[PDB]
């Protein structure tokens, strides 16, 4: 288990454009293409991302390419964010993957809502952080994925991802 296998679990793999849990056009391993309701908008973004006229279908290889880029750029965002970096650096490797997971799903702007949880995680109050984490739209809207991420933050183990 590592961040790549974890996000593969949480996001699945689809080779055609689909809508994610928010109704937004997505492809691959949860690569968000656009928030526009226009399928043409999404297809243009896909072509832009892959570098060819895909017609809304990619290969597994191409999907994994987007995925590695997306992960990399998530971590890079964290390290450039003054509010997130101190917390990510306070964390062990397992919990860091949980942090990357949340950013992958909700963005940095998503995770800004989580100041209080962030503090509790930085203080290593795992059980308190876990309770606070779940008082969130995120938990309410995607409960099973959030439970797994919270378990990972609470325990510092991959237990929620074995199987
Ligand atoms: C950096 C980015 C996202 C995060 N979620 C919980 C801790 C944390 C640190």
Residue numbers in the entry: 1 to 163
Article excerpt on this structure:
To demonstrate the versatile applicability of spitrobot-2 we demonstrate reaction initiation and fast delay times in three independent model systems, obtained by single crystal rotation data collection: Streptomyces rubiginosus xylose isomerase (XI), human insulin (HI), and bacteriophage T4 lysozyme (T4L). Using 12 crystal structures of three independent model systems, we demonstrate successful cryo-trapping via observation of conformational changes and ligand binding within 25 ms. Spitrobot-2 is an integrated benchtop solution for cryo-trapping protein crystals with a delay time of less than 25 ms. It is suitable for monitoring ligand binding events as well as conformational changes of main and side chains.
The biological function of T4L is to hydrolyse the β-1,4 linkage between N-acetylmuramic acid and N-acetylglucosamine in bacterial peptidoglycan to aid cell lysis. The L99A mutation of T4L forms an internal non-polar cavity of about 150 Å3, which allows the binding of various ligands after large conformational changes that open T4L to allow ligand binding. As a result, this particular mutant serves as a model system for studying ligand binding at allosteric sites. To explore whether we could induce and capture larger conformational changes, we used indole as a ligand and observed structural changes after 1 s and 10 s, respectively. Our spitrobot-2 cryo-trapping data clearly show that structural snapshots of the binding event can be obtained at delay times (1 s) inaccessible by manual methods. In addition to indole binding, we clearly observe a conformational change in the backbone of the F-helix of T4L in the indole-bound states, which is shifted by about 1.8 Å compared to the apo state.
